[PDB]
């Protein structure tokens, strides 16, 4: 039955709008400056950064880091609320609900971060900002390579033309994974994933019939995510060695057990 999967697909688009205030659509309207309804403040060097706050309400490299760490937590809270709305997620072994979040969360961040990105920068601060890719690359040595990996992935990723209804199910799929180290009841997690996967596959053919082997292409990107996360996890640690100036958030370092 296919009309069962269209229920699950439209259901996860309701949760997605309810759990994530800035969608890809709202972000496209902003990034497509042809919709110059209310443009954002471009931050392209250290001088336009200091002018950022005064206007778009908020060392530079540390200050930008602590910024993306403020949104990181506001994403896990939205992800986590979205995690709860995936059928059967609340009924799972609550010890594995933590394992699902711990390993799956950054992968959703980078997925949805690609929405706010294009070749040149990233929508920041509810879409009121737009920090430049080059400015970020031209940061201090340990940070000149913090966002660039994500910008390279997002360019490959956004070429799939996924929309919010698409992304929703793909988001659920990533969350529900058996691969995660330390899962207890691996069996009931895989049961629901196959539902989402089936739901994903059908949603993709309906909304993108004129691109065959798209459901194919998307899943290869699910493993590309784990490389971003890993490499980012380990580069976040060598900075913890040289930068005792930093105080990383509780929630983030609660999940930042590497490997």
């Amino acid at each position: 039955e296919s009309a069962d999967l269209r229920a699950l697909a439209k259901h996860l688009y309701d949760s997605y709008i309810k759990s994530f205030p800035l969608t890809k659509a709202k972000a496209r309207a902003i990034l497509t400056g042809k919709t110059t309804d209310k443009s954002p403040f471009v931050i392209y060097d250290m001088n336009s950064l200091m002018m950022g706050e005064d206007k778009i309400k908020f060392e530079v490299a540390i200050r930008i880091f602590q910024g993306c760490q403020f949104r990181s937590v506001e994403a896990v809270q939205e992800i986590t609320e979205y995690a709860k709305s995936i059928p059967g997620f609340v009924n799972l072994d609550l010890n594995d609900q933590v394992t699902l979040l711990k390993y799956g969360v950054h992968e959703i961040i980078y997925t949805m971060l690609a929405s706010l990105m294009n070749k040149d920068g990233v929508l920041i601060s509810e879409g009121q900002g737009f920090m430049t890719r080059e400015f970020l690359k031209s940061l201090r040595k340990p940070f000149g390579d913090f966002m660039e990996p994500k910008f390279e992935f997002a360019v490959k990723f956004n070429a799939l033309e996924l929309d919010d209804s698409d992304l929703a199910i793909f988001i659920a799929v990533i969350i529900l994974s058996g691969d995660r180290p330390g899962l207890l009841n691996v069996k009931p997690i895989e049961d629901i994933q196959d539902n989402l996967l089936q739901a994903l596959e059908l949603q993709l053919k309906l909304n993108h019939p004129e691109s065959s082997q798209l459901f194919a292409k998307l899943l290869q990107k699910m493993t590309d995510l784990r490389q971003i996360v890993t490499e980012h996890v380990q580069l976040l640690q060598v900075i913890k060695k040289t930068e005792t100036d930093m105080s990383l958030h509780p929630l983030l370092q609660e999940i930042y057990k590497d490997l």
């Binding site: 896990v76 809270q77 986590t80 609320e81 995690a83 709860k84 609340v90 609550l94 010890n95 609900q97 933590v98 979040l101 711990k102 509780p250 929630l251 609660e254 999940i255």
Partner: peptide
């Protein structure tokens, strides 16, 4: 080890 902050994001 069991991460306390997340469990309070699930209950609520």
């Amino acid at each position: 080890k069991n991460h306390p902050m997340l469990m309070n994001l699930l209950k609520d």
